[PDB]
Design a protein around this ligand. Structure first.
Ligand code: RET
Ligand code: R16
Ligand code: R16
Ligand code: D10
Ligand code: DD9
Ligand code: DD9
Ligand code: DD9
Ligand code: DD9
Ligand code: DD9
Ligand code: CA
Ligand code: CL
Ligand code: CL
Ligand code: CL
Ligand code: NA
Length: 240
């Protein structure tokens, strides 16, 4: 695969996992240090949620770097690598990101339950797809997971956006900037999966790991940077 076998264990993709580790740790430490001077009760909740997003990803990237949680899946005459930590990362961090958006929009706990329940189903079915042993199952679960993603994004774009609007310009501008980011970045994930090693196999694991790493850093550290610099996080929140 495209990269460089840093640890001398036959995995050129560790180059990208190492860089990803470093960027996630630096982002975590930046937000943490910026958080220590924050007193407002709402801002503290946003910081707490948001620090954990690159924080948990840091742990997942480090695990992947060292080869912890790596195994192979047999698909006919081919053995696909799967890093379990990647899915565990997304299972925890995607609800956290949605929770940030739901706090901005100030929506009810039933709406949040729906959003995060569909998000969890998306990640689980993606994992089932990655572990499946025939191409028909892989594409099927991928499609299922993708329809779940559209439902999440549809809710962000319609119901949560409408709610944020009622909260005035500071909140609605921040909500709309972040939602613009999410709609684009999150859609990139199923596209990479299907053209990469898990699907059609056009790109190999090296390029795939690199691109997931860029997406992950943008979706976590980039998102965090946009949110935490906004005056909107000082406004009232109601936790679920
Ligand atoms: C911290 C990283 C973020 C924001 C991760 C997002 C991940 C996804 C939107 C993943 C989506 C997938 C599908 C919709 C289908 C194939 C399986 C996944 C999990 C790659
Ligand atoms: C012989 C060693 C080869 C090393 C190749 C280094 C190329 C530069 C890597 C930069 C990766 C993109 C970072 C993306 C930032 C989010
Ligand atoms: C205003 C000072 C900025 C310092 C931020 C430090 C964080 C370093 C992590 C780099 C990751 C870049 C992600 C951005 C992608 C759009
Ligand atoms: C909502 C759909 C947005 C599509 C963005 C495409 C990104 C190209 C990889
Ligand atoms: C443990 C962190 C991994 C450092 C690797 C740096 C790659 C250039
Ligand atoms: C042989 C050592 C190569 C190390 C690659 C680091 C790339 C810079 C981020
Ligand atoms: C003080 C909080 C550190 C950042 C969260 C790390 C999470 C460990 C898995
Ligand atoms: C949660 C990060 C994992 C660190 C374990 C390192 C062990 C080296 C083989
Ligand atoms: C596939 C993304 C769902 C959003 C559709 C509505 C467009 C509003 C920006
Ligand atoms: Ca406040
Ligand atoms: Cl403050
Ligand atoms: Cl306060
Ligand atoms: Cl490759
Ligand atoms: Na290596």
């Amino acid at each position: 695969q495209a990269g460089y076998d840093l640890l001398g264990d036959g995995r050129p993709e560790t180059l990208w996992l190492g860089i990803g580790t470093l960027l996630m740790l630096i982002g975590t430490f930046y937000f943490l240090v910026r958080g220590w001077g924050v007193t407002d009760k709402d801002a503290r909740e946003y910081y707490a949620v948001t620090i954990l997003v690159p924080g948990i990803a840091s742990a997942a990237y480090l695990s992947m770097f060292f080869g912890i949680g790596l195994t192979e899946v047999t698909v006919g005459g081919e053995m696909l690598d799967i890093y379990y930590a990647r899915y565990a990362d997304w299972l925890f961090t995607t609800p956290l990101l949605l929770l940030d958006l739901a706090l901005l929009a100030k929506v009810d706990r039933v709406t949040i339950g729906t959003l995060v329940g569909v998000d969890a189903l998306m990640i689980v079915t993606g994992l089932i797809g990655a572990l499946s042993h025939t191409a028909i199952a892989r594409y099927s679960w991928w499609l299922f997971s993708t329809i779940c993603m559209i439902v999440v994004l549809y809710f962000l774009a319609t119901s949560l956006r409408s709610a944020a609007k009622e909260r005035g310009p500071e909140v609605a501008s921040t909500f709309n900037t972040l939602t613009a980011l999410v709609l684009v970045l999150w859609t990139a994930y199923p596209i990479l999966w299907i053209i990469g090693t898990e699907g059609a196999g056009v790109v190999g694991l090296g390029i795939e790991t690199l691109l997931f790493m860029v997406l992950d850093v943008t979706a976590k550290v980039g998102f965090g940077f946009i949110l935490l610099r906004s005056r909107a996080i000082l406004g009232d929140t109601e936790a679920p």
